[PDB]
Amino acid sequence: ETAQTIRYGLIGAGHMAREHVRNLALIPGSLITAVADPTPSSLEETAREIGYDVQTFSAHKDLLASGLVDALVIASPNDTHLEILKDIFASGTNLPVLVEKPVCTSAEQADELEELAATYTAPVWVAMEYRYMPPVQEIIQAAHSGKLGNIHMLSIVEHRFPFLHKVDAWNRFAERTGGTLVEKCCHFFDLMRLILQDEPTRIYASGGHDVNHMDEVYDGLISDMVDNAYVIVDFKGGRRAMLELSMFAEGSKFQERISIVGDAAKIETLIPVAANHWIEGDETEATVEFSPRSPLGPEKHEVPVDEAVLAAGAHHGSTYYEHLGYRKAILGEGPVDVTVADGLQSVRMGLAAEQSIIEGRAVELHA
């Protein structure tokens, strides 16, 4: 049981970086060595969380020259993801990267990243982790095993609280985030491609900035970000999906609903609000419900998460499994489950959707 050891470098050391550290703390062989972030308060809090001594830098290139690291984790703001990847690619360090979603934030960016990512050879994983939520694992297995028959429809409903406060308010601005439908919803456009095993062809969306962040001023600016939307997505093989997002529906005991409908059965999972954002002492569990057409007879069970794994994140235990998988890719004992290609599609879908909200019209996509 000699744990092989991986030395992790964190580039960006804020809210999500600290979720990575709590999760790596549950995985033997996991050691944080370097942490780069140009905001001192961020380095301080992240160092407190790690709980043991680490080298800190205020710039990533220094971290890259340190020789302190076996693998990278990028958790900086969305629009910075490309620069840091270009830099990692040109470093000659050939380091594995776990880069947070969205992998980028514009069409120009995605084009560039597509060409560049081809020549880089080390594991590059886009940190879209929703698929590893245990409840959502079942849903996906069921869909893939043909237990639903031919799949026709996928609905995703997220009802949640306004965008949280982040360092320098980066998440309040379309140009830094890619828009709400890239920032928040890329996870969901990915899930669509994964579950339906198909590529989108058309997308229409209707959304607004109707409720949130109205009294928050940032050097004379208000948030330009969407806080509610419906999205319909058409696919190559005649399947269709729908996304409902509200960022002011936080009263809802269940934050996510995902239903898949095939021609033999339907399946539906309900994901609760994380314990951190919900009332104290009212922890509900996630459910999965299987509903065959014939014979009638729905079966529903709770899908529990290990008390520790659940407590380490606000994404229902997913971050832990993401890291077990990143580890295996780093060691060569497993694949990159969520590629750059995956990331680029999810972003392009979200960008199309942001475009549809602006022009009041559907938008075509290319394979």
Ligand X SMILES: NC(=O)c1ccc[n+]([C@@H]2O[C@H](COP(=O)([O-])OP(=O)(O)OC[C@H]3O[C@@H](n4cnc5c(N)ncnc54)[C@H](O)[C@@H]3O)[C@@H](O)[C@H]2O)c1
Sites of contact with ligand X (CB under 6 A): 11-17, 36-39, 42, 60, 75-78, 80, 100-101, 127, 129, 166-167, 170, 315
250: partner contacted, choices its own copies, ligand X, none (Cβ within 5-8 A by kind): its own copies
- Distance between CA 81 and CA 75 in Å, rounded? 8
127: partner contacted, choices its own copies, ligand X, none (Cβ within 5-8 A by kind): ligand X
Question: Is residue 292 a contact point for its own copies (CB under 8 A)?
Answer: yes
Which tokens hold the place of 42? 């961020």
Q: Measured from the CB of residue 3, what is the shortest distance to its own copies in angstroms?
A: 41
Question: Is residue 263 a contact point for its own copies (CB under 8 A)?
Answer: yes
- Distance between CA 300 and CA 298 in Å, rounded? 7
Give the residue, chosen from 244, 275, 287, 331, that forms a contact with its own copies under the rule CB under 8 A.
244
Neighbours of 107 (CB within 10 A): 13
Give the residue, chosen from 40, 146, 298, 304, that forms a contact with its own copies under the rule CB under 8 A.
298
Q: Segment contacting its own copies (CB under 8 A): 31-39, 111-119, 199-207, 216-224?
A: 199-207
Residues, the chain:
367
Given the complex with ligand X, which of 39 and 93 has the nearer CB atom? Answer: 39
- Distance between CA 167 and CA 100 in Å, rounded? 16
- Distance between CA 265 and CA 260 in Å, rounded? 8
Alpha carbon 72 to chain centroid, angstroms:
17
Which tokens hold the place of 227? 């806080």
**Residues 50, 337, 335, CA angle at the centre, nearest 5°?**
95
Give the residue, chosen from 76, 228, 319, 346, that forms a contact with its own copies under the rule CB under 8 A.
228
23: partner contacted, choices ligand X, its own copies, none (Cβ within 5-8 A by kind): none
51: partner contacted, choices ligand X, its own copies, none (Cβ within 5-8 A by kind): none
Question: Is residue 296 a contact point for its own copies (CB under 8 A)?
Answer: yes
Q: Identify whether the C-beta of residue 241 lies closer than 8 Å to the C-beta of residue 190.
A: no
- Distance between CA 48 and CA 321 in Å, rounded? 24
Give the residue, chosen from 26, 249, 275, 311, that forms a contact with its own copies under the rule CB under 8 A.
249
Rg of the Cα atoms in the chain: 20
Given the complex with ligand X, which of 127 and 270 has the nearer CB atom? Answer: 127
196: partner contacted, choices its own copies, ligand X, none (Cβ within 5-8 A by kind): none
The pairing of strands 254-262 and 151-159 is antiparallel
**Helix (H), strand (E) at residue 39:** none
Question: Is residue 211 a contact point for its own copies (CB under 8 A)?
Answer: yes
> Which amino acid belongs to residue 283?
E
Q: Which residues bind its own copies (CB under 8 A)?
A: 152-153, 155, 157, 159, 202, 204-208, 210-211, 228, 230, 232, 234, 238, 240, 242, 244, 246, 248-253, 259, 261, 263, 265-266, 278-279, 291-294, 296-298, 360-362
